[PDB]
Ligand binder design. Structure first.
Ligand code: HEA
Ligand SMILES: CCCCC/C=C\C/C=C\C/C=C\C/C=C\CCCC(=O)O[C@H](COC(=O)CCCCCCCCCCCCCCCCC)COP(=O)(O)OCCN
Ligand SMILES: CCCCCC/C=C\CCCCCCCCCC(=O)O[C@H](COC(=O)CCCCCCCCCCCCCCC)COP(=O)(O)OC[C@@H](O)CO
Ligand SMILES: CCCCCCCCCCO[C@@H]1O[C@H](CO)[C@@H](O[C@H]2O[C@H](CO)[C@@H](O)[C@H](O)[C@H]2O)[C@H](O)[C@H]1O
Ligand SMILES: CCCCCCCCCCO[C@@H]1O[C@H](CO)[C@@H](O[C@H]2O[C@H](CO)[C@@H](O)[C@H](O)[C@H]2O)[C@H](O)[C@H]1O
Ligand SMILES: C[C@H](CCC(=O)O)[C@H]1CC[C@H]2[C@@H]3[C@H](O)C[C@@H]4C[C@H](O)CC[C@]4(C)[C@H]3C[C@H](O)[C@]12C
Ligand code: CUA
Ligand SMILES: [Cu+2]
Ligand SMILES: [Mg+2]
Ligand code: NA
Ligand SMILES: [Zn+2]
Lengths: 49, 514, 58, 98, 227, 84, 46, 43, 73, 259, 105, 144, 79
């Protein structure tokens, strides 16, 4: 007889993956976290003195 | 009945269970302290306060994880439950003194929590070096309460080590030689020898620190002719053997778990595993000054400690390769305990290899007191001692309790923990190579990215620890009672059923000589 | 002196179900309660002292 | 230089210590201090395993110097064999009252 | 100094730091290879339904398991100890500088000729000038002559500290009652940073080291101006 | 060595008693005379307030905080010198 | 003698899963909360 | 290992309750302290 | 119809192990060649190239003119 | 009913009362050193003494009165006592290591010499040599006690054990008098620190070993020992030899070599 | 050690013992499948005839399943072995696991 | 049939591909027709029907090899649930950012970073490989 | 004899990382020399080398503490 995995396995895998990717992308990009990446290729140096 | 059974115990299984409960509660305390560490570091700036409250948290994190989680679970919990059953003994040799080793731990933990409540805490590092830990820079009671906490833990384990040595040497069946005892029993015996010899030297050193702080001695104070470096030698003469004490019973459980879920009757190369554990226990007493390569020692002393420290990789590699050879040709059962043991083999090997990097003093000049060392030891502690503990806890939980865990939940738990500890610690290698110091509450801005990821990792391991409590609740809530277990002919601790009766081996096993 | 060990062997082997620490009779009970009372009372007192010492004093 | 005054074990040992001392004098081992010597272990000449109940654990060290011991319950009735080497064992129950 | 997302060591500023980088490269490949050799046997052990569960003879394969690691350790130790003894060789310094650790700043003494000494404290974050580095800058830098062998002597007047500059491969603990020596030689002018490296109380994170390496004649005039 | 004494043949109380009264207690009696002979107070050295001696980094938990546990006024000066 | 068997060789009751949940919540929850309250205590002092 | 079916089956809904209460028992007290840190500090 | 031929039946696990331990070693030599070339050689060359005609006084003057020094304006 | 020879101990309150007595003594030393109060410490010393007394009482009840010390049990206790002595040897080694580290490399604060400037050591040929003869002598008289006991001689066992305890007390009184007479103190730099802490823990062990010998003396007066079964006396004799050997190392290292 | 032929001969003789008992049948098969080999047809043949003397049809079927299992992913091995056993299968009336539907998951 | 906890010391049944002939039969108690089928088994097996052979197999053993060795969908539940709880973790971290962490230091402001970056290039931070090596001091831009 | 003094030279009596005894020995030699020279009415200028070496090597606070202790009568080294 089908067990829990046969009946719900596909849904748990699809929704867990969807949710995980969505909430990590959101946390990573939408709430003000400063990752401080390399300036190389990204920052234009500006006069400081 | 309740007080006679649980406060007055002379029974090795119930005392084992007390140690497992105590060690699980300590593990929640050590986990919260590690999350406060990672919250402070998870963005640049100051979260809590300055380095004092921060290093009180770091200091307590280490002492709780070492002395109140790992040692009580591996030796008090699994050693008391399994050792007498694996040798067919009716109990430990000193069953009443065994209960005092247990009961000295709640008061030791109470002293450590009192140290952090009074004055400003002991913000010294778990090494407690003077003069920072002396009575000028750490005036008041906190560091003496830490010393006393360590004395009580020290007596508990020294008496425990006497009990295990005696029990393992004296209480086997008369036909069983020491070369017919299982590897976990050997690993406990060796760890108990290390405890017996190393703890008294730590007790001497922290007593000297105690009298420098309260009786006007000057062991470690140059004004009286003392030397702060003498404390470091006495402390690490204990502290190097201590890390082999933390991992050896883990090696012993990994050998059983790998053997069992490979469907084998025995681990590959048994006498080489015994030789490897005795050689690692022996060499682990002659290497301690690899913790002191920047203190200003002579070049030839640094050459000797670099070489003696590396040599431990030889017997240790014998054991890793012998675990691989035990998997070889197995009928592999992918149980959640097997996954913990496979994760142990791989993560312990990573951390052993960064240890090898550090053994080179010339490179250790630059890596010492940075996060490269923190990465080295959390790969052997948080992904070796912890993984061997979770491996042995899921493997033997049905023996201790009579109930089964849900294996799907336990595999999920393993998967989350494996992702969280690697995300936590792997980036700390980059922080160490690029120069971030240890014991810092904040860092120059360039170190932001890796600290942020490492702090995010620690929260994933928090989610794993919360789910572990739920999984244990689910097992006791559903009460699926064990019926049959595989391979009892080579795993004697299962043969009295689950859980075994209060008294086992009232009639000893029959073993002939021939 | 005379050897009265046989008397003590009979006393401690009497089949009365008592644990060894109480098998000498009522004086064992007294000494046990005195010990346990000082340990538990002293432990409460050590907690009170922690509570007192956990806060700064004028 | 002469007096006695110190009791002997014969006079004063008691409880289990005495039982073990009196049994050892008779060449008997009711408390399992000694390792039993194997028989040839065939079905006609099985290892005889005393017990005070209806079953006892046997550990079989199948060949000399094996580090692996094979463990199993031996029950009252017909001889059983070690599941690794086949050597035969048979339980002989008594009661320490027989 | 370190830069964002850095993976490995700061670029070498001294010949001995250069040596440590190539030695680290040599060691890390080994680490790589062993790590990967293990992951891989491991996965080889676990990916077949074929079995062989009867007793396996250990002696031949244990020879391989001990001798090849022993040889790998010797391949790491030989260049490791060459470097240890080379750094220890006599080198003839042209200058001696002392540094004393304190809670929480460093002092510096340059007393070969005159009585020159001063204190060196972290620039607080709210006083940084634009472009300066948070937790790393100091008010008084340790000016030193480039391309010259300098003896640094390190001690402390209170608790332990440790005086480190990762780009020069330097870390010497600062212990009261003891004078530890190390040598320093920069191949290049510039600013080279480090941070206190032994836990020393409330502001351990906040007592950094900045070396300013310049031509000898600039160093001499700076010295005279600091009297 | 072998000592210079000379006995054996099997094991005895008699012999260890002979060693107790014939060698061990005589040696104690001898050392007791040697001692009770070089005894009797020695002239105290001038006081010098050396900074590596008379350490006080925290008061002692008894008395006035400044006296050692087995303080002897005749031979143990305080950080400020011998008592008055 | 003492009770033997699953659920009886432990110093806490598993006879009711919800009372067990409460006790386990209090037990692990108190160990996890303690360091946060100690930090609060240290911050509040000075 | 083999075992009997659960004597007291814990249904998905009861698991969701045990899981939620267990997670809240760790999250709430720590969350309250950390939420109020500025209050403890800037006191 | 035709009979099936007799296949190898014995030592299948040993044979698979032999074959793969040799492939495992070959990676290691192949990876070692890459790691030496992509990292270690590249480093030696970056340092040798940087210092080959490096002018430390000229590097100093650029820094000095950029205003970075306390001791040199 | 067991058919092994090992001792299943009755459930006991003494492990808990001893653990609590350790909490009371350590929190008591803390309250003495920092809060000017001896109360907790006296209560923990009292409970510790009460615990020791009842626990070892019960071990005598279990053995001499109830017969549970079969040869297999006694053999375990032999190993236990040897292992304990080994751990006490390692504890003294930490203090010997401290002594040699400071004395072999005397720092400038001391005058760069050993003994430090301003230290006037005791003469090792006076009371220290006397103490050495006392403890060596008491190793001879305990060996006499041991052989008399094995030979079934009650009166000479008691006479030799009394002698051995009298010498233990003599050494303790001699040492107490030398501590009072010493012109240096525990606060006199690392010389006074090593001297008093190493000889002081050794004196505490002499007081422990002497108490243990007095326990054996009263049990012997009560006929508890047989000519073949007397492990408490053997253990106290091994502990007593240990205290003598530690004294010999202290005498040679600190009193003689370090003078 | 011994040749392959000698190994095989000793196992043939083990199962060919006329009065082999049930315990010895089980001990022999459960020991034999611990080795790194799939047993030759002539060994299987002797085990199947021991099943027959012990009036145990089910264990003959289980022996055929375990041959297939010991071959792992070498799917050519089991069909060759059944080919070689067909005269014995037919003489003793042993149905294979496939003919009984016992290969269905 | 029905295994009891009180049987743990007795030989027991196990489906294990490496222990194909377990120590006892899966079913020992027989019905009248099952007793008749065990008698029939003593005669030629060619006279047993396929259903009778299958019934003999299923008296002796619980599961076939193909049954006990079958693959399952469990990995979907494991991987999916682990991703769920990893996703839940990011909720905790969002909460912590919003309610626990304050503003990070002003040195991370865009203009500060531009200036600091130029000052790092002016002091030639890591000029051999790590940082300034990646800047083109001739063309005044990041190397391609 | 040898002006153009730059710093204290390598000294094979004190070849290791701990140089505390080098500072201390030079401090002692200097002061022992100066006592010798001011006793016999000779010239302290002959003690100059030890003075230069201890000034280069020794922390200012150690010299200062040792000079205070010489003045107080509590310097524990022999001069
Ligand atoms: C379980 C705990 C544990 C274990 C097992 C180890 C194992 C080792 N450790 Fe570790 N270590 C710690 C816990 C541990 N460590 C802690 C807590 C600290 C810091 C303490 C502090 O400051 O607070 C630390 C610090 C530490 C330092 C000090 C760094 C510094 O402060 O600057 C060093 C340096 O030598 C070191 C080295 C090693 C080595 C060589 C091993 C070796 O024993 C590992 C040997 C194992 C392997 C090598 C892997 C398996 C082998 C093979 C697969 C064979 C092939 C391999 C080769 C040929 C090399 N460790
Ligand atoms: C005849 C010798 C026996 C000693 C009797 C005296 C009481 C102390 C008890 C003994 C314990 C011994 C070691 C503890 C350290 C110090 C005591 C050293 C011995 C001693 O008695 O030293 C005295 C100082 O005592 C002092 O400070 C006294 C301070 C007394 C309080 C001691 C508190 C310290 C307790 C720490 C113990 C921790 C143990 C750890 C066990 C490890 C677990 C595995 C010397 O007197 P002084 O006036 O300085 O000089 C003499 C001048 N005329
Ligand atoms: C003063 C300030 C605080 C310090 C407190 C310490 C004070 C002093 C304690 C002195 C120790 C007294 C020990 C008495 C033990 C009596 C019990 C006993 O001796 O029990 C014996 C067993 O030995 C046994 O358990 C062996 C028992 C082992 C005892 C170990 C004793 C040493 C303990 C020292 C504690 C060390 C502290 C270290 C400090 C760093 C009983 O077996 P038998 O003798 O064979 O008799 C049976 C025959 O009659 C049958 O025919
Ligand atoms: C039956 C169960 C056992 C539980 C026993 C509980 C006893 C509780 C009573 C304690 O109260 C007292 O308060 C004193 C202050 O009021 C202090 O005395 C101490 O403190 C004084 C200064 O306060 C010193 O001068 C004294 O020497 C010193 O011993 C000390 O805290 C204690 O004596
Ligand atoms: C390091 C491990 C822990 C990290 C993750 C913790 C995740 C937080 C779980 C929620 O904790 C609660 O969060 C509330 C806010 O969401 C707080 O309420 C606070 O905020 C509410 C909204 O402002 C007010 O209604 C409340 O009164 C006020 O207490 C509340 O006290 C706190 O228990
Ligand atoms: C009364 C008693 C007789 C012993 C007995 O057989 O009961 C004797 C025998 C040996 C005696 C002891 C030993 O002779 C040694 C001691 C010698 C002292 O002069 C008296 C106390 C002393 C401690 C004695 C007291 C008492 O007279 C003892 C104990
Ligand atoms: Cu100064 Cu850390
Ligand atoms: Cu170490
Ligand atoms: Mg350090
Ligand atoms: Na921070
Ligand atoms: Zn066998």
């Amino acid at each position: 007889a089908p067990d829990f995995h046969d009946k719900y396995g596909n849904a748990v895998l699809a929704s867990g993956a969807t949710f995980c990717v969505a909430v990590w992308v959101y946390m990573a990009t939408q709430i003000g976290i400063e990752w401080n990446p390399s300036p190389v290729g990204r920052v234009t140096p500006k006069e400081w003195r | 009945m309740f007080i006679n059974r649980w406060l007055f115990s002379t029974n090795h299984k119930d005392i084992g269970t007390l140690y497992l409960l105590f060690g699980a509660w300590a593990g929640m305390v050590g986990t919260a302290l590690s999350l406060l560490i990672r919250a402070e570091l998870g963005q640049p700036g100051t979260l809590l306060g300055d380095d004092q409250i921060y290093n009180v948290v770091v200091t307590a994190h280490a002492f709780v994880m070492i002395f109140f989680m790992v040692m009580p679970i591996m030796i008090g919990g699994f050693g008391n439950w399994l050792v007498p059953l694996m040798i067919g003994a009716p109990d430990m040799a000193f069953p009443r003194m065994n209960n005092m080793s247990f009961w000295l731990l709640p008061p030791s933990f109470l002293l450590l929590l009192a140290s952090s409540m009074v004055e400003a805490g002991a913000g010294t590092g778990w090494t407690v070096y003077p003069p920072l830990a002396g009575n000028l820079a750490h005036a008041g009671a906190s560091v003496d309460l830490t010393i006393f906490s360590l004395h009580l833990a020290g007596v508990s384990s020294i008496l425990g080590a006497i009990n295990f040595i005696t029990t393992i040497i004296n209480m086997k069946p008369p036909a069983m030689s020491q070369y017919q005892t299982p590897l976990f029993v050997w690993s406990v015996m060796i760890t108990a020898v290390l405890l017996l010899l190393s703890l008294p030297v730590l007790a001497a050193g922290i007593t000297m620190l105690l009298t420098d702080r309260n009786l006007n001695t000057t062991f470690f104070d140059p004004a009286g002719g003392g030397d702060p470096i003498l404390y470091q030698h006495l402390f690490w003469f204990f502290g190097h053997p201590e890390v082999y004490i933390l991992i050896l019973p883990g090696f012993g459980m990994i050998s059983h778990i790998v053997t069992y879920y490979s469907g084998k009757k025995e681990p590959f190369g048994y006498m080489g595993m015994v030789w490897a554990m005795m050689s690692i226990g022996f060499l682990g007493f002659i290497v301690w000054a690899h913790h002191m390569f920047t203190v200003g020692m002579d070049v030839d002393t640094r050459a000797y400690f670099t070489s003696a420290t590396m040599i431990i990789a030889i017997p240790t590699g014998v054991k890793v390769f012998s675990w691989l050879a035990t998997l070889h040709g197995g009928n592999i059962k992918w149980s959640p305990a097997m996954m913990w043991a496979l994760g142990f083999i791989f993560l312990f090997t990573v951390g052993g290899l960064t240890g090898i990097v550090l053994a080179n003093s010339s490179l250790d000049i630059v890596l010492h007191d940075t996060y490269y060392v923190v990465a080295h030891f959390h790969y052997v502690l948080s992904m070796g001692a912890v993984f061997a503990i979770m491996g042995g806890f899921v493997h033997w939980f049905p023996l201790f309790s009579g109930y089964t865990l849900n294996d799907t939940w336990a595999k999920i738990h393993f998967a989350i923990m494996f992702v969280g500890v690697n995300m936590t610690f792997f980036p700390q290698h980059f922080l160490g190579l690029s120069g971030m110091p240890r014991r810092y509450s904040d860092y120059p801005d360039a170190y932001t990215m890796w600290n942020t990821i490492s702090s995010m990792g620690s929260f994933i391991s928090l989610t794993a620890v919360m789910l572990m409590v739920f999984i244990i609740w689910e097992a006791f809530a559903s009460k699926r009672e064990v019926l049959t277990v595989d391979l009892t002919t080579t795993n004697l601790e299962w043969l009295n059923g689950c859980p075994p009766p209060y008294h086992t081996f009232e009639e000893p096993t029959y073993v002939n000589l021939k | 002196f005379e050897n009265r060990v046989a008397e003590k062997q009979k006393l401690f082997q009497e089949d009365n179900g008592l644990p060894v620490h109480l098998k000498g009779g009522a004086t064992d009970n007294i000494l046990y309660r005195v010990t346990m009372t000082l340990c538990l009372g002293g432990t409460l007192y050590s907690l009170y002292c922690l509570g007192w010492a956990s806060f700064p004093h004028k | 230089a002469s007096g006695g005054g110190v009791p002997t074990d014969e006079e004063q040992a008691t409880g289990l210590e005495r039982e073990v001392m009196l049994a050892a004098r008779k060449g008997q081992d009711p408390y399992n201090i000694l390792a039993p010597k194997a028989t040839s272990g065939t079905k006609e000449d099985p290892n005889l395993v005393p017990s005070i109940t209806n079953k006892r654990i046997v550990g079989c060290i199948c060949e000399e110097d094996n580090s692996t011991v094979i463990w199993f319950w031996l029950h009252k009735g017909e001889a059983q064999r070690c599941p690794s080497c086949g050597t035969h064992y048979k339980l002989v129950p008594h009661q320490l009252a027989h | 100094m370190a830069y964002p997302m850095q993976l490995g060591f700061q670029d070498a500023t001294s010949p001995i730091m250069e040596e440590l980088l190539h030695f680290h490269d040599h060691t890390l490949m080994i680490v790589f290879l062993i790590s990967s050799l293990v992951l891989y046997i491991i996965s080889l052990m676990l990916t077949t339904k074929l079995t062989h569960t009867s007793t396996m003879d250990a002696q031949e394969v244990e020879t391989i398991w001990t001798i090849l690691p022993a040889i790998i350790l010797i391949l790491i130790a030989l260049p490791s100890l060459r470097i240890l003894y080379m750094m220890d060789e006599i080198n003839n310094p042209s200058l001696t500088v002392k540094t004393m650790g304190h809670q929480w700043y460093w002092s510096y003494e340059y007393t070969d000729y005159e009585d020159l000494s001063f204190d060196s404290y972290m620039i607080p974050t709210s006083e940084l000038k634009p472009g300066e580095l948070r937790l790393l800058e100091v008010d008084n830098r340790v000016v030193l002559p480039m391309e010259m062998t300098i003896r640094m002597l390190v001690s402390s007047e209170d608790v332990l500290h440790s005086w480190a500059v990762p780009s020069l491969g330097l870390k010497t603990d600062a212990i009261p009652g003891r004078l530890n020596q190390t040598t320093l030689m920069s191949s290049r002018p510039g600013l080279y940073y480090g941070q206190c490296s032994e836990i020393c109380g409330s502001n351990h994170s906040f007592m950094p080291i900045v070396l300013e390496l310049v031509p000898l004649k600039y160093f001499e005039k700076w010295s005279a101006s600091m009297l | 060595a072998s000592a210079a004494k000379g006995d054996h043949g099997g094991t005895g109380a008699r012999t260890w008693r002979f060693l107790t009264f014939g060698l061990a207690l005589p040696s104690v009696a001898l050392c007791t005379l040697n001692s009770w002979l070089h005894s009797g107070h020695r002239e105290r050295p001038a006081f010098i307030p050396y900074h590596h001696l008379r350490i006080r980094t925290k008061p002692f938990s008894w008395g006035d905080g400044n006296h050692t546990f087995f303080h002897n006024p005749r031979v143990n000066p305080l950080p400020t010198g011998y008592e008055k | 003698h003492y009770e033997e068997g699953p659920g009886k060789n432990i110093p806490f009751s598993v006879e009711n899963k919800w009372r067990l949940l409460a006790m386990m919540t209090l037990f692990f929850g108190s160990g996890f909360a303690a360091p946060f309250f100690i930090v609060r205590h240290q911050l509040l002092k000075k | 290992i083999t075992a009997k079916p659960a004597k007291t089956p814990t249904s998905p809904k009861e698991q969701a309750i045990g899981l939620s209460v267990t997670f809240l028992s760790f999250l709430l007290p720590a969350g309250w302290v950390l939420y109020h840190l500025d209050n403890y500090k800037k006191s | 119809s035709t009979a099936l031929a007799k296949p190898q039946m014995r030592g299948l696990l040993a044979r698979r192990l032999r074959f793969h331990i040799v492939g495992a070693f070959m990676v290691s030599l192949g990876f070692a060649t890459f790691y030496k070339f992509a990292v270690a050689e590249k480093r030696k060359k970056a340092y040798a190239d940087f210092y080959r005609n490096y002018d430390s006084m000229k590097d100093f003057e650029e820094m000095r003119k950029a205003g970075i020094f306390q001791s040199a304006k | 009913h067991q058919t092994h020879a090992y001792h299943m101990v009755n459930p006991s309150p003494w492990p808990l009362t001893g653990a609590l007595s350790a909490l009371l003594m350590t929190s008591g030393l803390t309250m003495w050193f920092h809060f000017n109060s001896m109360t907790l410490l006296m209560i923990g010393l009292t409970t510790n003494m009460l615990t020791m007394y009842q626990w070892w009482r019960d071990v005598i009840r279990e053995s001499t009165f109830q017969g549970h010390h079969t040869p297999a049990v006694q053999k375990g206790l032999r190993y236990g006592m040897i292992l304990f002595i080994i751990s006490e040897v390692l504890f003294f080694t930490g203090f010997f290591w401290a002594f040699y580290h400071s004395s072999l490399a005397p720092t400038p604060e001391l005058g760069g010499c050993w003994p430090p400037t301003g230290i006037h050591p005791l003469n090792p040929l006076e009371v220290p040599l006397l103490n050495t003869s006392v403890l060596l002598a008491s190793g001879v008289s305990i060996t006499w006690a041991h052989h008399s006991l094995m030979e079934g001689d009650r009166k000479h066992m008691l006479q030799a054990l009394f002698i051995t305890i009298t010498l233990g007390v003599y050494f303790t009184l001699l040492q107490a008098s030398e501590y009072y007479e010493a012109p240096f103190t525990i606060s006199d730099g690392v010389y006074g620190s090593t001297f008093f802490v190493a000889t002081g823990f050794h004196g505490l062990h002499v007081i422990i070993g002497s108490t243990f010998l007095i326990v054996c003396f009263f049990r012997q007066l009560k006929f508890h020992f047989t000519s073949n079964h007397h492990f408490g006396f053997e253990a106290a004799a091994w502990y007593w030899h240990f205290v003598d050997v530690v004294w010999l190392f202290l005498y040679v290292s600190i009193y003689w070599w370090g003078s | 050690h011994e040749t392959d032929e000698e190994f095989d001969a000793r196992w043939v003789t083990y199962f060919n013992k006329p009065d082999i008992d049930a315990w010895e049948l089980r001990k022999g098969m459960n020991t034999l499948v611990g080795y790194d080999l799939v047993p030759e047809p002539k060994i299987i043949d002797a085990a199947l005839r021991a099943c027959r003397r012990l009036n145990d049809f089910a264990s003959a079927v289980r022996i055929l399943e375990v041959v297939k299992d010991k071959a792992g992913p070498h799917k050519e091995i089991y069909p060759y072995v059944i080919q070689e056993l067909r005269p014995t299968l037919n003489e003793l009336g042993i149905s294979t696991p496939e003919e009984l539907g016992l290969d269905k998951v | 049939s029905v295994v009891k906890s009180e049987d743990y010391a007795l030989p027991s049944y196990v489906d294990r591909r490496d222990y194909p002939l377990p120590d006892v039969a899966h079913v020992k108690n027989l019905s009248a027709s099952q007793k008749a089928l065990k008698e029939k088994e003593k005669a030629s097996w060619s006279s047993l029907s396929i259903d009778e052979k299958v019934e003999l197999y299923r008296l002796k053993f619980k599961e076939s090899f193909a049954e006990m060795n079958r693959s399952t969908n469990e990995w979907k539940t494991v991987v999916g649930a682990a991703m769920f709880f990893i996703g839940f973790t990011a909720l905790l971290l969002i909460w912590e950012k919003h309610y626990v962490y304050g503003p990070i230091p002003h040195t991370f402001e865009e203009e500060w970073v531009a200036k600091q970056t130029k000052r790092m290039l002016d002091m030639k931070v890591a000029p051999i490989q790590g940082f300034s090596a990646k800047w083109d001091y001739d063309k005044n831009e990041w190397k391609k | 004899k040898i002006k153009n003094y730059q710093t204290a030279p390598f000294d094979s009596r004190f070849p290791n990382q701990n140089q505390t005894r080098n500072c201390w020995q030079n401090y002692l030699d200097f002061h022992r020399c100066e006592k010798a020279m001011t006793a016999k009415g000779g010239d302290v200028s002959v003690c100059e080398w030890y003075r230069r070496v201890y000034k280069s090597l020794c922390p200012i606070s150690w010299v200062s503490t040792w000079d205070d202790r010489r003045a107080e009568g509590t310097f524990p080294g022999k001069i």
